[PDB]
Design a binder for this molecule. Sequence first.
Ligand SMILES: *[C@@H]1O[C@H](CO)[C@@H](O[C@@H]2O[C@H](CO)[C@@H](O)[C@H](O)[C@H]2NC(C)=O)[C@H](O)[C@H]1NC(C)=O
Ligand code: NAG
Lengths: 180, 177, 14
Amino acid sequence: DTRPRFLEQVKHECHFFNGTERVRFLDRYFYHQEEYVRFDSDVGEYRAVTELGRPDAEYWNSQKDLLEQKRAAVDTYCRHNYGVGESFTVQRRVYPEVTVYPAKTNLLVCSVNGFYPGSIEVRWFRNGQEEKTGVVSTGLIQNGDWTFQTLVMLETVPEVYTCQVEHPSLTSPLTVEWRA
Amino acid sequence: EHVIIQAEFYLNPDQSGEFMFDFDGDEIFHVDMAKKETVWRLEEFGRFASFEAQGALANIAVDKANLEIMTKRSNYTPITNVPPEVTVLTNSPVELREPNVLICFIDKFTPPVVNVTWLRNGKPVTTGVSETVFLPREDHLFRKFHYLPFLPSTEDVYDCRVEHWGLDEPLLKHWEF
Amino acid sequence: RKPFQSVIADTGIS
Ligand SMILES: *[C@@H]1O[C@H](CO)[C@@H](O[C@@H]2O[C@H](CO)[C@@H](O)[C@H](O)[C@H]2NC(C)=O)[C@H](O)[C@H]1NC(C)=O
Ligand SMILES: *[C@@H]1O[C@H](CO)[C@@H](O)[C@H](O)[C@H]1NC(C)=O
């Protein structure tokens, strides 16, 4: 396929700080991956992000009913949709599954699977005390299905090893034990 | 604390569009523009919420209008192809005879056109496979997931085959027990 | 129960 490609994106972004106590709405226009013009609710009118967006910003800023409508969007759009989705997004809790197994390169893998939300602390312990400098991880992995996972690996010569998991779904830490 | 993004694109000359809602990087729903129906990322979301899927066509029609304008304004500057990072991992730790899911993660690419095939022992498999639509990234590139439910065996190897205009050859990511 | 609301892009000038 010889033909050249041309792509327009638009992202209508609602940013929430302390639930709906503080909201910022951003109406962002893209040509390929280059933002050319944006509306920001903290500014209350359009601004050109590049040369290519100057005509659209002038044009749109001259239509006062258009700007009037966009400035109500923190209430009619952002706060409305937070309120629609809260109970199954903001309040979604899915518990982690924790396994420990040895791997080749010798590694103790602490696998933490199927949890929501994303915020998690995984710590390695060897006979009592905490190891940081021999630990390597996957980072947080989004599975694309409203579920994360992470693999936290201890580079070690296998004593009693304990993997500690802290997640919002758990009243207290989950601590899994592995004996050599 | 949280971001909700209504993200849309339109692409010429393919005339491919997409309309979708994202919460903190997860898809809430997209509109199937053909059928005019709301496709919920999880079944359960559709018990709590509705959408006017009919109206998504109006939004895409504005994006096409804007594209035609920006195409001329840019002097017909075409998109630069960016080939994907591809990674293959399981839902959970693999145990023999314990059903599991292979995830193919296709990340950081444009334009949003991609051929993905699951290969079992080098042959295409479709039983049970599902995929997401193109998902937006903070850098305005795309990411995408394909899923293959499978029964783990010592006798099968798997590959995710990914075709994109940014790549010389198709890209194969290997997995095996 | 409750509907999600979309906003529409503004159309630019030629
Ligand atoms: C995805 O697969 C399709 C079809 O399998 C590829 O397309 C075709 O091959 C060339 C493209 O220049 C054309 O002569 C045909 O019209 C297409 N065939 C079919 C059956 O559609 C398409 O290019 C692939 N996409 C990518 C990114 O490689
Ligand atoms: C969030 O909202 C309430 C006001 O309704 C405020 O009193 C509270 O302190 C806020 N929380 C934080 C962490 O600021």
